[PDB]
Amino acid sequence: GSHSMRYFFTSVSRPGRGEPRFIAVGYVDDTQFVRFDSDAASQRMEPRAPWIEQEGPEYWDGETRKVKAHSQTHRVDLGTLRGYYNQSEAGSHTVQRMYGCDVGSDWRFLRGYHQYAYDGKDYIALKEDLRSWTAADMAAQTTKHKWEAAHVAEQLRAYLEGTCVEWLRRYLENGKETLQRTDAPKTHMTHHAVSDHEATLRCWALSFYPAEITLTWQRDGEDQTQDTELVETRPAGDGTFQKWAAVVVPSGQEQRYTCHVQHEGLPKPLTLRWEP
Template sequence: MQPPRCCLLLVLLYLFLLSGTWATLQGTFTIRLLQTSTFQNTSFVETEGIGLLEDIQLGSLDKHTWDIHFSQPWVRPALPHSEWDTIDNMLKIYMHKFIHLMTEGAIQKDVPYPFVLQFMAGCKLYPNRTSQIFAYVGYNGQDFLSLDIDNATWILSQDTDLARYVRAAFQNYTTLGEVMEDIFNDTCINAMEILLSYGRAALERQELPVATVFARTPSPHQLLLVCHVTAFYPQPISVAWLRDGQEVPPGPQLNTSPILPNADLTYQLSSVLAVAPQDGHSYACRVRHRSLGTRSLLVPWGNSHLLLITGLLAGLLAAGALAALLLLCLCRRRKHQGTEESQSRNSILSKEA
């Protein structure tokens, strides 16, 4: 039995999802196709797959029908209907051959069920229009095989009978590496540039970060200042704590979480700074992001609400004191005027007598 053109078909499918016209976006961009196949037993296999441009989902694979569902409105117009039919047919052929090969290998090598196989294939396009392709195979969440495109060979990540069997199946298709290299040397660049043109608005989308600063007290001797930043896009961001206007250097007192996704394709993270209560310093969280341009988002902490209330009360007290002083001066002036008028009347009556 001839082994399926497993990764080749994956990559072809991945690239056929792309089309359009030349884009002038600058930077390094990566497209990836992710496939996860769960083999429950010899007769039941469930496969899921998605295609990504950077972190933007282009489409997904229906696990029941193996049809492609587009996640972005600008993906389907990239190719004429006839080409999508070709891709659809090629995908279904690949899925049948892939499942047959893996099931046959599991029987021969007595692989226990259930097990999970994962594939990641893709292409990275650099600003100078050179490209790099990659393909990896995983087994039960562990590295399994990787493609060495320069030598057109598959490299074992774990030396097992099953890994050697799968590598031999892929390697028996002798022109696999050569075909993939030809495809990616030309097709990756052209297809990526086309896709970048169609998806330019999505790739250039910018969402402003929203930052909130608050405190936690895990013990009477420790205060945790938390800067939570959310709703920003794209992903790269800089979050730092300032102490008296100076950036706090990395250390055990500073802990920043990984960048995590939100459901609306924005991101969030938290930065926590441990300080001693009432240490006498002022603190602020500084956020820098592409959407802010050259500006920075600065959110101070230092019992800011209490300081605001204290400031308002001080202002009110000062205004009250000023008003009381003016009223006192006015009363004294009126009293003084009354005394003068009384003395003047008494003087006049005295003269008349």
């Protein structure tokens, strides 16, 4: 299946309370592998997945210096944006940056990303094909022109289409035991008497990886959405994910409903039906 490497950066100004907070997190697919937190005591980029620990001191020293340079740049940006938008230094603002790359099943580059946001809204991003910038407003236009004068877009692409893909491949290989794993969902169905005329059927998918999954209900062989509830896919806290779909059905008509589960780890989609 496809893969991706993503870096997420969050910088928050903290008016008169020291330096802004800077947090950096790297993922490969749905697996976090590194982190940096300006408030943490180490002041080091740290491993969060087992396979990355095979990288040597040179890698950690370099990633630490780079993320620190990143922290400084974002710290300056907070002051610059405040200026662009003529905001006060007493207010807390947030800058977020995400960049990374996607590869197909063959591990060949599919697309890259470099997006920037100020206070939760798009500020400036590189377009889908990476060949131009999208600027939200005049403040972002100012950044856009500075970036086009420094050929930042071409600097980023060299990385997104090369370096980024190269490191993603390296990590996929080094952490093959877990990154290229496919944990099919453990499934089951529960039943609850809701009332004098209703019963709830809950279809569970658990301990699955990657996070991408599809859970759907059907009644009499037809897609069922009425009186259904589907929760956002969530992390179990052990590297795997969980998700469920429930439907309220008339008492006694339980077996006319079926839950269907599609996940990469399943050679075939599973179908669950209530067996009392």
